[PDB]
């Protein structure tokens, strides 16, 4: 592997960097719930964040984790400020979309092998 990294070196500065920005998002859940005038319960906004970080824990490599940092670092520009007009935030909460079957027999009635 002959390529320079982005920020980290090996497995330790990376896995303290990802723990840094989690304390930003944990602080900046109960701000946007009134900064956009959106009416839900505040514990919903904290459940989505602790859901989202456990998704990517299958990585065995540096600078891939560092790539996800840059996306995670960027969103705190728009979210902590007011650049999303109430609608780009609420797309994480799929309220409209109908539930998927996800079990074998219910797929077999409706749909040609999804």
């Amino acid at each position: 592997t002959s390529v320079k990294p982005i920020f980290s070196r090996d497995m330790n500065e990376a896995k303290r960097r990802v723990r840094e920005l989690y304390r930003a998002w944990y602080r900046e859940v109960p701000n946007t719930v009134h900064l956009f005038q959106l009416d839900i319960s505040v514990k919903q906004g904290r459940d989505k964040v602790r859901e989202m970080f456990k998704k990517n824990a299958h990585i065995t490599d540096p600078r891939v984790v560092d790539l996800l940092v840059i996306k995670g670092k960027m969103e705190l520009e728009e979210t902590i400020k007011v650049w999303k007009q109430r609608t780009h935030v609420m797309r994480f909460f799929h309220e409209t979309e109908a539930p998927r079957p996800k079990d074998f027999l219910s797929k077999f009635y409706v749909g040609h092998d999804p």
Binding site: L35, F36, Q37, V82, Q85
Partner: protein
């Protein structure tokens, strides 16, 4: 005794036409979505009203130029008079006394 019935006509005709527009033909109980909208063609303004210095000095400066036109106001009544060397030389004083108050402030106005 009409001065005083020369204006209470004019204000009761004024308040008539506003309540036959704001009230009466109005009452919006249907859908009338008064949600979070109506925010003056914008969004949420989390900042309050900030102080602006260059728009305070415009208030005070006018007020001190407004006073001594009321001193200057009875100049046409000061014509049909007695001793008039006094009346001329005192009338010219206040205007210069208004003029110097420019020229001192005129060396520092700012972007007004």
């Amino acid at each position: 005794m009409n001065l005083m019935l020369a204006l209470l006509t004019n204000f009761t005709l004024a308040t008539l036409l506003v309540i036959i527009a704001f009230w009466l033909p109005q009452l919006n109980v249907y859908s009338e979505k008064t949600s979070p909208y109506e925010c003056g063609f914008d969004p949420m303004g989390s900042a309050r009203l900030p102080f602006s210095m260059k728009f305070f000095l415009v208030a005070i400066t006018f007020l001190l130029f407004d006073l001594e036109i009321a001193l200057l106001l009875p100049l046409p009544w000061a014509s049909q008079t007695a001793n008039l060397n006094t009346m001329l030389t005192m009338a010219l004083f206040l205007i210069i006394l208004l003029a110097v108050s420019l020229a001192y402030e005129w060396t520092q106005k700012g972007l007004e």
